[PDB]
Structure formats: C-alpha cells, structure tokens
C-alpha cells in the first residue's frame, strides 16, 4: 500500500483515479518532438515493459510471502533498467514514463520490497493502460 508516485501517493482506493487523470493529462497538451510533435505513445512502444511487468506479476501472484524474494527483485530491477532503456530510445516514451511515474512506482516497490506494494503497482499499471486505451489506443 501507500505507493509513492513522486508527488502524490496511491493506494487500493486511489490508483484508478490517478491513472485516469494522468492519461487525460497525456491527451491534454501531448508530447512535442523537435519538429513540433505531435504524436502520442503506442502499445507497441512499451509492450516489452508491459510483458516484463506481466511476467513478474505472474511470478509474485504465485507466492504467498509478504516480502519479495531476491530472484523477483532482480526481475523488477531489470524492469526498471528496461524502462530506462526505451525511455532513452525515444522521447515519446520518456515523457510517458515521467508524467505517469512508472519509474517512481518501480523505485517505491524496490524499496518497500513487499508483495502488496508490487500488487498495487501492477494494478496501477493495468489501470494506466486501460485508460490509455478507450481514450487514445494504438
């Protein structure tokens, strides 16, 4: 619980509202390139990150321990490394990660090191993608 997103925290009763707010703020004044924008992110630009998050979620959901094991924390660290990778690979993903704080949530999970923290992060990510679609998509 109490997952820090940098500015304001989220919990089991909050993640959907903040995910929707972040996605709506994505559509309001979207990303601008060097050549004046004006595209948004697509699913097949963070699909690898989403697949890694899904794999780690499957691994965690099959464990009843309240504390994440080091073998799973390695997976979350690799998730953060990859997020840094595609963030620098293209700026359309960098601002998407910055404004919808994937990195802050990953760091908070890697600090709390608890099963519930990662479950809340996964729920927040799922809500983020769900609101990204039905408003944008692709």
């Amino acid at each position: 619980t109490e997952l820090k997103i940098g500015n304001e925290k989220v919990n089991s009763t909050n993640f959907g509202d903040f995910a929707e707010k972040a996605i709506r703020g994505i559509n309001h004044k979207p990303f601008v390139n060097s050549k004046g924008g004006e595209q948004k992110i697509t699913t097949s630009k963070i699909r690898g990150i989403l697949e890694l998050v899904n794999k780690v979620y499957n691994r965690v959901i099959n464990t009843n321990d309240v504390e994440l094991s080091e073998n799973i924390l390695a997976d979350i660290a690799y998730i953060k490394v990859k997020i840094a990778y595609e963030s620098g690979r293209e700026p359309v993903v960098k601002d998407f990660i910055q404004r919808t704080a994937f990195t802050a949530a990953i760091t908070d999970v890697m600090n709390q090191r608890t099963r519930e923290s990662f479950l809340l992060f996964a729920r927040y990510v799922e809500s983020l993608i769900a609101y990204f679609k039905f408003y944008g998509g692709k």
Partner: protein, 214 residues
C-alpha cells in the same frame, strides 16, 4: 494416409525474417531476425514460408497474375493451402511447420555465428548525405531442414498436388524468403526434397519422389 515432405532450405544469401524487436535483450541489433525463444536459434516461420509459396504458386498457376483475395484462388491452391469461405471451406492438405536451422555445429566449425549484422545506408538525394543503418541477417550457408505434412485426401490428384508443390518450391528458388529480398537478401535453395509416408506405405511414393526430385 498422410505424407511428410522432407528437405533442406539453404541460404544462398543472408535471410532476414522480421523479429519482435521488443524482447531481444538490451543493446542488440536495430532490426533483429525471428528466433526460437528457447534455443535462440533463428527460424523460418511456417507462416512466412507458406505465405510466400502460396503467393508464388497462386500467381503462376492462375495466369501469371494474382490480384484476388486468398480465398478466391484456384482449386489447386485452395485444396493445398486451405480456404475459409462461407460454403466452401477447404481443409488444407499441407501443414507447414516452423523451421529452425540445424547446421549450427557446421557454422561453429568455421568460427562464425548463425547471424551477421549488415550495414546499409540511404543517401538523401537532395543533400547527398548518407544515413547508415544496421540489420541482422542469418548468414548465407545456413541450412534449415523442414518438414511439411501432406494430407492424402484424394488418390486421384496426389500427383498433380505434388507437381504443384515442386513448382512452388522451384518458384521460391527464383525469388526470396522474407525480408529485404529485392536488396540482395533472402535467396534460398531447395535440395534433398523427398516425400515419405508418415504411417504405412504409399503405392505411388516412388512417382512422387521423382516428381519431387525433378
């Protein structure tokens, strides 16, 4: 009765079947080839080989031209590759399979990896400035032993079906298999084309082998 079409696909030039480019680690080549997830072996997907063979065979069988949807092909094409029409559902007699390369040991004998990196650039014509890029290709000389299952449904047209299959293999040898084919890539060859009976024996299997070998 069911038949198995053995053979090998030899890369005359480098081949590039487009990969996922989202799960091949970090810091890999710009455009990777498709590989087996477990063994990391480059493979020729059965879908891609089937699609290229079907396109070439349908174009050559009909008139030399082909503009229709895949479901509106000739009877031979539909009976070999299947059809999903409303009242005309042909069950495909050919079952293609993913083809991993087998001669990794042979390639490792020459101290070369299965895949290379090809450096290309595009020169902007109004500026005369080059734009380098890198792609990954399975090196020439790689061999891909494949297996295609043939459903022997009608005894009266197995000879014609295998004539069409040999013709499609021949057409693939004068074209490419996936990737930047017009730009020097994807040229393949077929040899050791032999058909065997999956279970039991086929009394016309010697005629099938000689039309599949010539």
């Amino acid at each position: 009765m069911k038949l198995v079409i053995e053979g090998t696909i030899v890369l005359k030039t480098g081949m590039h079947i487009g990969g996922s480019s989202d799960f091949s680690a970090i810091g890999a080549v710009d455009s990777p080839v498709v590989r087996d997830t477990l063994t990391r072996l480059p493979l020729i997907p059965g879908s891609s080989l089937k699609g290229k063979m079907r396109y070439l065979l349908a174009k050559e069988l009909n008139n030399g031209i082909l503009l229709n949807e895949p479901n509106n092909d000739q009877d031979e094409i539909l009976r070999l590759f299947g059809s999903s029409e409303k009242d005309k559902i042909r069950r495909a007699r050919l079952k293609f399979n993913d083809i991993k390369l087998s001669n990794l040991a042979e390639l490792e004998t020459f101290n070369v990896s299965s895949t290379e990196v090809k450096f290309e650039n595009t020169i902007n014509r109004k500026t005369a400035v080059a734009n380098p890029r890198q792609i990954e290709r399975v090196i020439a000389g790689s061999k891909f032993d494949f297996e295609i299952f043939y459903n022997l449904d009608d005894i009266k047209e197995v000879e014609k079906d295998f004539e069409n299959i040999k013709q499609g293999f021949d057409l693939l040898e004068f074209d490419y298999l996936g990737g930047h084919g017009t730009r020097g890539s994807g040229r393949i060859a077929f040899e050791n084309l032999s058909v065997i009976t999956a279970v039991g024996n086929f009394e016309k299997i010697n005629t099938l082998n000689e039309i599949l070998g010539a």
